[PDB]
Amino acid sequence: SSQIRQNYSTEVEAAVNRLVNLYLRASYTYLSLGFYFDRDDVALEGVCHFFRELAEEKREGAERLLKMQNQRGGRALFQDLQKPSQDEWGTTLDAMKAAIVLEKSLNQALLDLHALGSAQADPHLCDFLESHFLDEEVKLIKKMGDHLTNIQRLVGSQAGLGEYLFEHCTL
């Protein structure tokens, strides 16, 4: 029971529980990514730390959603967390591509949740997504695309490697 619920549709409440599941799944994905790069036969600890920090941010996003669910008087319902889609993640390039795919899917889920909140005339929900999720996700995707470009440049060629060093080491 709740004595506080106001203007909070069952549709949104359900969608928020699904979004918590997606965020926790993504956190689990990034946990797997990070420990893959910590393998002795891979050994790119910087890549390990990049994904470890993303695992933490996606868990924090889920916790924010759960806190909001309780603030509106909705009820958290948890489902199974499906294991990540791969057990080994290939090259740095492969892993950064998988990460962008994952983030695009979370972004689309955020946009879908906004469409539902708009249809339900739920401005608190909209505000919440704007305050904590929409711009954070755009920033992250921009950083990943920048990373993808630089991995491609570096693994591709000696001119590529040259331009990278000029920017990174001289500038």
130 in a labelled binding site: no
5-29 as b/e: b if 16+ CB within 10 A: eeebbeebbebbbebbbbbbbbbbb
Q: How far is the CB of 166 from a copy of itself (least distance, A)?
A: 5
- For the segment 97-126, give every residue that binds Au ion (CB under 5 A): 114, 117-118, 123, 126
- For the segment 118-157, give every residue that binds Cl ion (CB under 5 A): 118, 121, 123
57 in a labelled binding site: yes
CB atoms within 10 A of CB 127: 11
Amino acid letter, residue 158: Q
Which of 158, 165, 151 has the alpha carbon at shortest distance from 100?
Answer: 151
Q: How far is the CB of 30 from Au ion (least distance, A)?
A: 9
CB 91 within 8 A of CB 103: no
Q: How far is the CB of 158 from a copy of itself (least distance, A)?
A: 6
Q: Which residues bind Au ion (CB under 5 A)?
A: 34, 38, 48-49, 52, 114, 117-118, 123, 126, 168-169
| Known binding residues for Fe cation | 53, 56-57, 60, 63
